Structure formats: C-alpha cells, structure tokens
Amino acid sequence: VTHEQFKAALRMVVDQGDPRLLLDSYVKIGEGSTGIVCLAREKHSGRQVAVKMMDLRKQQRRELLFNEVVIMRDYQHFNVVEMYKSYLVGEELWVLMEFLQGGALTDIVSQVRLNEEQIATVCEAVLQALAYLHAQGVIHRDIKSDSILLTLDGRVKLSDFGFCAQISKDVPKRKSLVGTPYWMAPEVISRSLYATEVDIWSLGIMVIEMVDGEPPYFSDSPVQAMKRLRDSPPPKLKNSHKVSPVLRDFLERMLVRDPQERATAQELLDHPFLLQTGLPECLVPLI
C-alpha cells in the first residue's frame, strides 16, 4: 500500500479539515514512540488541549496509527483519556485530547516515592479502566507508568492506546510481539497465543516501578531483559521488605506466569489491598 492510499484510508477515520488556524500557543510537553505531544490553546473557547502529532511516514508499524484515534473514539470511561477531535494535517495525524495538568506517572515516580495508599489509588483507577476495556475485548499491551496521566485534582487516566489490539469472535487471541520490553508478559515475548491477561502482568511490572523506581532487569538491554522475563520465575521487588503483606499478595496475583491463573482486572478490584485507596486528593501532593 502506498503512502497516499494509507493516508486516504486513515482520512476515513479523522474529522475533516485543517485545525491550524483554530489553535495557538503551541508548546511541546512530551515526546513519544509514535510522535510528539504539544500543549496548545483553542481560539474560540480558550480551552487548553494536548495535541499529539504523528508522522505517517516514520512509524514502526503505520497501521497502528488507526489505534491512536479509534480506541478513544469507541471507548469512553472515567479513567480513560478523552479525545476531542482528530485531523490529518499535511503528512501528520493530529489527535486532540484533554490536557491533564498532572502529567505522566513516570515523571512522578522518578521524582517522589509513592506510599501504599497512593499506589492503591493508582491501581484502582487503572484496574477500572482495564476491567472496562477488557470487557470490550481491548488488549492495551503497553501498560507502564508512561501510559498513566493525572488530572490537576489527582484523577488517574489511562492513555497511549497505539499498541491496542481489538479481539473478536474470529480472532480471539493475538500472537504478535507488541509492547515495551521490560513490561511485556512472558507469553507475549514467547509469541504464544494471548489475550487480555497480558495487561495484568504489565500492571504488576508498573507496581514494581512504583515501589522500586524501575522495572525489573532495567540495567539489562531490552532483549536480554526479555530473555530473562521469558525464562525466569516472576521478578521480585527489590524493596519487598518495605511493603505490606497485603500489597505483596496483590502483586503476586498479577505476576503469575500461568496466564489463566493470573488474576483478572475484575478480580483485582475485589482485592483487600484496594481497601487502602485514598481519595484522589492523596495524589495531589505528587503533582
């Protein structure tokens, strides 16, 4: 398929027109796997927006750009990023989304140590989003702290839908090597048939990010870390001695090699660890 044919197929999914003259105050706030994210402002309303800008020509797998629009188009939820509009702008896909002033969990975790109340609050929000998406047959495949954004008041929102898979009656499982190395489930790494369970493993690795500050094997190269995850018992918290038994139990139900024995999102929502959640306000001091 030529670039022009791909762009034409993608055009069927975006809103028509050129958005440029409707926006001002373009400021870059983040780089990404598929493109840049800029803060901007609408003229007619004055509303701040995040504008993700992605070049159709420079993608690992350009078909995944459809996911940058379709998932948020199809799926709305309290803990899922809201999309306003999308456009084709020259040779770029632009996706306009709610501005989340708290930024990404990654930049909190590298800077300040979350307590267990905060970890529980983050996990509960992410699990609500995942329980919902999983029930619609969406496998996120890129759960990690970078995918998690915070509102000003400490509301947690799932983002970064580019790697999503939408399963179906005819294709109920995927087999493709998709994810970010250190967070990928062993069954994805082994190119086994897999489904929504892979997100629960990745969430477990994110819990390790929140406790230790880094995923397991982070000092290894991505391929070496993947071989270790493929071949080893589940990875352990460096700071296992610092965490409550209940958090330990919660994590051990996520980092289970056997994908069928691994807890579902819905099951984790009923876990005693999440009785430790705080009000969204408990994350505001991180922002």
Ligand SMILES: CCN(CC)CCNC(=O)c1c(C)[nH]c(/C=C2\C(=O)Nc3ccc(F)cc32)c1C
């Ligand atoms: C000193 C700078 N700080 C720590 C390094 C904060 C850096 N981070 C920031 O400013 C920041 C802010 C304020 N928002 C975002 C990202 C998004 C947003 O708002 N809506 C979205 C919708 C989708 C999406 F995929 C990303 C975003 C970042 C990276």
